[model samples]
Target: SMEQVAMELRLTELTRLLRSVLDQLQDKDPARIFAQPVSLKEVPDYLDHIKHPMDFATMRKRLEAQGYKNLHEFEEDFDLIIDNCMKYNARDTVFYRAAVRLRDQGGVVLRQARREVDSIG
Candidate 1:
């Protein structure tokens, strides 16, 4: 159907534009942009004693240096990473998987914190 085809084309165009925005954001904060903390409760037993390469403390320092005062500021970046992985069928290497997992978990934590702050305010 012509209508269905037109709708799909529009979706595809929007997706590409979204990906471009994500890439631009990444270019601005290449290092700490995607860095997210995995909650202790979510850590596996084998990794319990090991520190993540991008632990919260390290990410906090970097983000602070970059003038990011809150995790919510990175909401779009985290969402972009997840979307890229899911939509584009990006590489599923261990690092990529781990990064996506950490970002997803951290996003939940960040959203919860944001909600708490909004309620208090």
Candidate 2:
């Protein structure tokens, strides 16, 4: 129970800080480079059922389409989306929890993608 609470709080703070950064980046071109925001409302339902790697494929597709040439690009917006969800809604909700997991996973996927490309070139 304590661990869960601690993890939740950590995620809340991270989400808040990330959202602040995203807000600051609003005027930048990369901030505008994204598909229509993905709905966090259904995140809870999909978290457990979705398979590894593939779980984030749809979200990653949106990132790729928006000219996220690498993880650095994708992570900025990914953090923003997750942070926004936590800010507008209570962090205790399933949506917020799922978002935390997805955000981390997204970073990993983006990093791997970048690595694969770098190795080939």
Candidate 3:
């Protein structure tokens, strides 16, 4: 339900950030990209709709189908690009999003495991 809104916001933020970075790259000053707020809270929402079980193989295929290589590679590259912008930005949405997604995914996995064990008994 919230997926569309979250995706829109994520794309907007990412695009703005990338555009700023590109401008800086062309001028040789990444500092300009840091002018906006950078918050860690946005990360979780960005990845919130990602399927549970997070099968690496499946995710890789999905990413490739969508024109991406892998989650880690995408994240690493995004982080590198955004980290430069965070230098002057006043917020850190990345940390919050990471924490929230991790917590939610872990909880679901553990719950599913417990359910499976119970069914076996």
Candidate 4:
């Protein structure tokens, strides 16, 4: 394990942190509105508002394969769920309100992720 530690070690922690965040994020909303794609029929030209679209479903798919090239990309997708809503719902919404719910949730897991990774360093 020690010999292999030099490479895959951080990868282990990385997967845990990502997985946990997704789990907690999933827990808060039973609606699971963010579970899948934006449904082209329901919302039109949404990409024009913000080109970057993402969901927990796709995020998890990306995770299992270890396709992520860097933490920067991981963090970007982490925010995209929240960021997706902040842009989508301008007014008259609660899931938008729930984004606030998930937003704070992200903050705490963020603390755990930072603290854990910092410990490994």
Candidate 5:
């Protein structure tokens, strides 16, 4: 077995896994509500409650730049995407319910992707 294959395979696989994670998360979000940056004009107090907001558009940029150093680093933002929604919107709201489904479903996709990365050996 050529160990020379290690670095190249790992990086490519990681990028693909991260991209796939975002795709599934976006699929779970039909409204594309989290696809772009949240406007302060629309939700004035949003930043006061949610810091480090995450969205697919930003995630795509970072992914293209190979920003994620590890899977959980992506996970941090992935969870933040939902956690921001979870925190900002009250549990009674429809957006919050969507966030709940996105969180749960996206979580499975993340785990499966993790399995793929771990299978690298």
Candidate 6:
């Protein structure tokens, strides 16, 4: 729930920033405004560890091993991706609709994950 609040705040900020930029440039095209710059530099490869639930216990163990020190880190990154997707992409329904899904699903995941951590001590 708190993560949702943070993501919403990030989305709001990104939307405001995009709107401000568009107003200043007098351009309404979200794509052009949010386009990534072309560069020769190699981009880092990233993957979502939770794309599907093959082994929730293992994934939970791995994440719990990180000590909740990095839980918010991934949330922050996810929030940014969602913000950009909503700003420039036409198919942003998934990102916005995910708020409810995350709340519902996240509770279960967090409960199990937290229990694992609690057991550690």
Measured against the true structure, the TM-scores of the candidates, in listed sequence, are 0.35, 0.40, 0.24, 0.81, 0.87, 0.28
lDDT of 3 by residue, 39-93 (tens): 3475444233332222223323434344332223434443443343343233566
Instruction: Please give the lDDT score for candidate 3.
Output: 0.38
**Which regions of candidate 2 deviate over 4 angstroms?**
1-66
Best prediction by TM-score: 5
Candidate 6 lDDT by residue in tens digits, 1-121 = 9998876665554444333322332222223322232122432222232222212223234333442233344334324433434443244565444433443444455455445434532
Clashing pairs in 6: none
Q: lDDT of all the models against the reference?
A: 0.47, 0.48, 0.38, 0.76, 0.84, 0.37
Q: What's the C-alpha lDDT at position 85 in model 6?
A: 41
Candidate order by lDDT, decreasing, is 5, 4, 2, 1, 3, 6
Q: Clash number for every model? A: 0, 0, 11, 1, 0, 0
Worst 10 residues of 5 by lDDT: 1-10
- lDDT string, candidate 1, 1-121, tens digits: 9998876665454444334433444443445534455445654542444322333344335443443333344455455445543433346665456456656555555555556445633
Model 3 TM:
0.24
Error of 2 at 14 (Å): 28
Q: Give per-residue CA lDDT, model 4, range 35-121, as digits (tens).
A: 887876787878788688888889889987765645567778978988889888864698588777777877887767667666765
List residue ranges in candidate 6 displaced over 4 A: 1-92
lDDT of 2 by residue, 1-121 (tens): 9998876665554444434333333323233322344444846553343322221334445433433434465465556666765554477977566566656655555555556445633
Candidate 1: lDDT of 33? 32
- What order do candidates take by TM-score, descending? 5, 4, 2, 1, 6, 3
- Which stretch of 10 consecutive residues in model 3 shows the poorest summed lDDT? 50-59
For model 5, the superposed segments whose C-alpha errors exceed 4 Å read 1-9
Instruction: Write the number of the candidate with greater lDDT, choosing between 2 and 6.
Output: 2
Report the candidate with higher TM-score, 2 versus 6.
2
